[PDB]
Every structure is written in C-alpha cells, then in structure tokens.
Scaffold this active site. Sequence first.
Site, PDB file in Angstrom:
ATOM      1  N   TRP A   1       0.674  -1.192  -0.156  1.00 36.34           N
ATOM      2  CA  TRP A   1      -0.050  -0.061  -0.324  1.00 36.34           C
ATOM      3  C   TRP A   1       0.764   1.251  -0.133  1.00 36.34           C
ATOM      4  O   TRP A   1       2.108   1.065   0.642  1.00 36.34           O
ATOM      5  CB  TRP A   1      -0.924   0.012   1.324  1.00 36.34           C
ATOM      6  CG  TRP A   1      -1.841   1.278   1.193  1.00 36.34           C
ATOM      7  CD1 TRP A   1      -2.657   1.637   0.276  1.00 36.34           C
ATOM      8  CD2 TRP A   1      -1.913   2.010   2.419  1.00 36.34           C
ATOM      9  NE1 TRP A   1      -3.294   2.605   0.732  1.00 36.34           N
ATOM     10  CE2 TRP A   1      -3.131   2.875   1.919  1.00 36.34           C
ATOM     11  CE3 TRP A   1      -1.382   2.068   3.553  1.00 36.34           C
ATOM     12  CZ2 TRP A   1      -3.474   3.995   2.743  1.00 36.34           C
ATOM     13  CZ3 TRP A   1      -1.875   3.241   4.525  1.00 36.34           C
ATOM     14  CH2 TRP A   1      -2.828   3.986   3.824  1.00 36.34           C
TER      15      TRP A   1
ATOM     16  N   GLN B   1       6.637   5.697  -4.776  1.00 38.98           N
ATOM     17  CA  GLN B   1       7.992   5.465  -3.943  1.00 38.98           C
ATOM     18  C   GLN B   1       8.768   4.444  -4.601  1.00 38.98           C
ATOM     19  O   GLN B   1      10.037   4.592  -4.545  1.00 38.98           O
ATOM     20  CB  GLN B   1       7.787   5.444  -2.335  1.00 38.98           C
ATOM     21  CG  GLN B   1       7.352   6.861  -1.960  1.00 38.98           C
ATOM     22  CD  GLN B   1       6.883   6.891  -0.433  1.00 38.98           C
ATOM     23  OE1 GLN B   1       5.821   6.188  -0.305  1.00 38.98           O
ATOM     24  NE2 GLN B   1       7.389   7.573   0.564  1.00 38.98           N
TER      25      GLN B   1
ATOM     26  N   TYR C   1      -4.618  -0.874  -5.513  1.00 35.27           N
ATOM     27  CA  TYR C   1      -3.398  -0.060  -5.064  1.00 35.27           C
ATOM     28  C   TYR C   1      -2.795   0.349  -6.260  1.00 35.27           C
ATOM     29  O   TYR C   1      -2.438  -0.497  -7.313  1.00 35.27           O
ATOM     30  CB  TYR C   1      -2.314  -1.129  -4.470  1.00 35.27           C
ATOM     31  CG  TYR C   1      -2.678  -1.680  -3.075  1.00 35.27           C
ATOM     32  CD1 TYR C   1      -3.737  -0.905  -2.360  1.00 35.27           C
ATOM     33  CD2 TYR C   1      -1.997  -2.503  -2.303  1.00 35.27           C
ATOM     34  CE1 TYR C   1      -3.949  -1.289  -1.017  1.00 35.27           C
ATOM     35  CE2 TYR C   1      -2.168  -2.865  -1.027  1.00 35.27           C
ATOM     36  CZ  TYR C   1      -3.402  -2.158  -0.412  1.00 35.27           C
ATOM     37  OH  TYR C   1      -3.696  -2.522   1.067  1.00 35.27           O
TER      38      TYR C   1
ATOM     39  N   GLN D   1      -8.170  -8.402   7.950  1.00 37.14           N
ATOM     40  CA  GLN D   1      -6.904  -7.471   7.918  1.00 37.14           C
ATOM     41  C   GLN D   1      -7.275  -6.012   8.349  1.00 37.14           C
ATOM     42  O   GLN D   1      -7.858  -5.126   7.558  1.00 37.14           O
ATOM     43  CB  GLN D   1      -6.550  -7.556   6.251  1.00 37.14           C
ATOM     44  CG  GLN D   1      -5.194  -6.479   6.308  1.00 37.14           C
ATOM     45  CD  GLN D   1      -4.796  -6.669   4.659  1.00 37.14           C
ATOM     46  OE1 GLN D   1      -4.659  -5.601   3.897  1.00 37.14           O
ATOM     47  NE2 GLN D   1      -4.242  -7.754   4.234  1.00 37.14           N
TER      48      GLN D   1
ATOM     49  N   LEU E   1       2.776   0.620  12.119  1.00 37.22           N
ATOM     50  CA  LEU E   1       3.346   2.091  12.726  1.00 37.22           C
ATOM     51  C   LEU E   1       2.459   3.263  12.675  1.00 37.22           C
ATOM     52  O   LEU E   1       3.058   4.350  12.706  1.00 37.22           O
ATOM     53  CB  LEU E   1       4.805   2.227  11.998  1.00 37.22           C
ATOM     54  CG  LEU E   1       5.832   1.120  11.961  1.00 37.22           C
ATOM     55  CD1 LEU E   1       7.029   1.566  11.197  1.00 37.22           C
ATOM     56  CD2 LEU E   1       6.071   1.015  13.908  1.00 37.22           C
TER      57      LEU E   1
ATOM     58  N   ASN F   1      12.840  -2.296  10.292  1.00 38.98           N
ATOM     59  CA  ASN F   1      12.085  -2.825  10.891  1.00 38.98           C
ATOM     60  C   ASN F   1      12.265  -4.508  11.346  1.00 38.98           C
ATOM     61  O   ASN F   1      11.646  -5.004  12.357  1.00 38.98           O
ATOM     62  CB  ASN F   1      10.589  -2.729   9.988  1.00 38.98           C
ATOM     63  CG  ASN F   1      10.197  -1.462   9.886  1.00 38.98           C
ATOM     64  OD1 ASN F   1      10.530  -0.602  10.738  1.00 38.98           O
ATOM     65  ND2 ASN F   1       9.474  -1.036   9.019  1.00 38.98           N
TER      66      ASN F   1
END
Length: 329
Positions: A21, A27, A54, A178, A210, A297
């Site tokens: 996502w 990016q 997406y 989800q 996050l 992470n």
Amino acid sequence: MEYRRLGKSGLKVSEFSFGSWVTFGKQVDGGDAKTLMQAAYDAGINFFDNAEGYEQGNSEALMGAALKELGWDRDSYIVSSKVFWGGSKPTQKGLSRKHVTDACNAALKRLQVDYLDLYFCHRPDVDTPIEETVRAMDALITQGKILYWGTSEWNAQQLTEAYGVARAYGLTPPTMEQPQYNILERRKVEGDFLPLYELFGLGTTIWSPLASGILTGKYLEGIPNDSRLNLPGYEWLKERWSTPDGREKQAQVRELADLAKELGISLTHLSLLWCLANPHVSTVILGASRLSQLEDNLAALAHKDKVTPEVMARIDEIVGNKPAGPQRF
Ligand SMILES: NC(=O)c1ccc[n+]([C@@H]2O[C@H](COP(=O)([O-])OP(=O)(O)OC[C@H]3O[C@@H](n4cnc5c(N)ncnc54)[C@H](OP(=O)(O)O)[C@@H]3O)[C@@H](O)[C@H]2O)c1
C-alpha cells in the site's frame, strides 16, 4: 523469523509480512520492489500483500513482474489480492459476484500466478448481501483459483453473518481478517473481534502497525520532506493527523518515545513488537518505502524480551485506549 498459524488455519505466516500500500508504483518502482521483496524473502518473510485498488492495478503488476523475475518456488510463499476498488463504474467496485470474480481473474494475471493464497474483501459492501459474496468466494475455492478468503475492516456482525451463511449453505467459511492495529488503534482487534477468535478461529494480518509512520516518532517535531504525510495525493492523510484528535495522539507518541528510550529500544521497534505481543495477531504486515526501513523494521525481532507485561501496562496507561472486554451482568 518465527511463524504463526493464520487463526485456526494450518497456513503458517511469518510473524512479519510485507505489503505494498502507498509505496508500490510510486516511492517503490519495479526495480526497488524486487530488491525489497528479495530482502524480505531472505529474512524469512513468506507473505506478500497487495490489492486491486493499489495504484489502480499497477502495484499488483509490479509485484507480479518481481515474482516472475525472482523465481521463488510457488510453495514457499503466500500472496494476496483484495477486491473492492476496481474502477469508477458500478460493476467495477464492491463485492458482487461479478466484481469478486472479475477482480480475482484480473489479479491472477497481474500477479502472474495460477492461484491466490489469500483473497480478501477489501471493505464491507452494504449494497451486496454477504450471502452473495460468500457464494462467489466458494466458487473460486472449488475452481482452485484461491485457497483462503477473508475480509478487511468488517465489523463483528458482518463477520458473524459470513460464518453463519457459510454453515447454512455448505460454503467455505472465511479465514482471516486484515484490520488496522497499532498502539493508537485497537478497537477491532481488542474489542469488536474479541468473541470471534474463540467462536470461529479468525486469523489476523494486521495493517499499519506504525500508524502510517507516526509510531516511528519521525513526525514529533514536524513533517519530513521525504515522508508519507508529505506525498502528493496523501493530503487527506496529513489532514487526519492534523485534527485535534490526531494532535492528542501525537502528544501521546512523545510519551511513548520517552518510554522507548528508557527501555533502550527505538519507538519503531517497540511499536512493532507491541503488535506481536497480542496472541490474536497472526502476522504484522510491514510497510517500507526504501530498503533501509525494511532492514530497520526486521531488526525489531531481536528485542522481544524488552517488551514485558509491565511495559504493556505502562503503554495502556499512556494511551488510555485499551478497549473494554465483554460486559457481564
Ligand atoms: N486492508 C487495509 O485496510 C489496509 C490498510 C493499510 C495497510 N494495509 C496493509 O498493511 C501494510 C502496511 O501498512 P502501512 O504501510 O500503513 O504500515 P506502517 O508501518 O504503519 O507505515 C509504513 C510507512 O511508514 C514509513 N516507515 C516504515 N518503516 C519506517 C522506519 N523504520 N523508519 C522510518 N519510516 C518508516 C514508511 O513511509 P514513508 O517512508 O513514506 O514515510 C512506510 O511506508 C500495507 O502495505 C498493506 O499491505 C492494509
């Protein structure tokens, strides 16, 4: 890497997964998708999440091209699609038998796979009977096009309805849900869904661990130029966090960052491990716009022992949002 059953199912998901996502198709371009996906795979991540919505199919196209080039054994990983947002026209969205079926066939071609391991209803569709959606999913199971189906951000009434329809009509029950889940958003996983775990064995692949990056603490002093909230097209997201409710949450993030420093842990690592401390979480889906974030992470997994019951209680005290349990009389 450790692995958890997806609810009561026998499917074992890596405790950290990786999603697409926002990042894929913007990016994260095609070459970066391959790099991130291989890094995740080499670390033992075995579930990769996507959706038709997406970047209007381009995220799935990029992930499929990466899967083809990387050449992983198909039996060694789990891939999803999610159906709801497939275009602007009335037959191109929602959970009708038509759009559930069209979107599954389309996702198979984009992802370049013969079957989806997981296929989610991306949102609930109050304009399609849940019975119809369950029937459409069951036909895809019997055809072999999907293995498990589930839902995203449904409420417990809707999920209970789906299990009841599956039982009544001899159809395949859903497996998994989800939902967003993080220190700042707990309502479904720890509140609404509570009875569903024991009743039905519902698994969870949790989203935004996050809080879109808020729980890294990177926004504590302002908005970084190279940050999600500053991306073009995500002004709506910057706006939500600028509300008074979003500002109170950000003030709590400052307290959480002070707790993390006291523990010798980054807030990022504390926030990811906090999610794993819930035994009802099957996997935490990570997001990353660049390889260094994925590596950061993954490093959280070395600090599980720092997140104790005492730490969980202090976090409850800071944020004050632990949902009430079942009510007794
Ligand atoms: N079904 C649903 O409703 C739903 C909703 C949301 C997400 N999901 C799924 O959950 C997955 C993860 O959600 P999410 O992307 O929102 O997760 P997240 O962990 O809450 O946010 C990830 C973003 O935070 C930044 N970030 C991540 N790690 C960082 C680090 N160590 N240091 C600094 N910045 C870091 C990056 O954004 P920047 O670099 O741009 O700041 C990254 O794109 C998604 O890919 C999707 O598979 C599903």
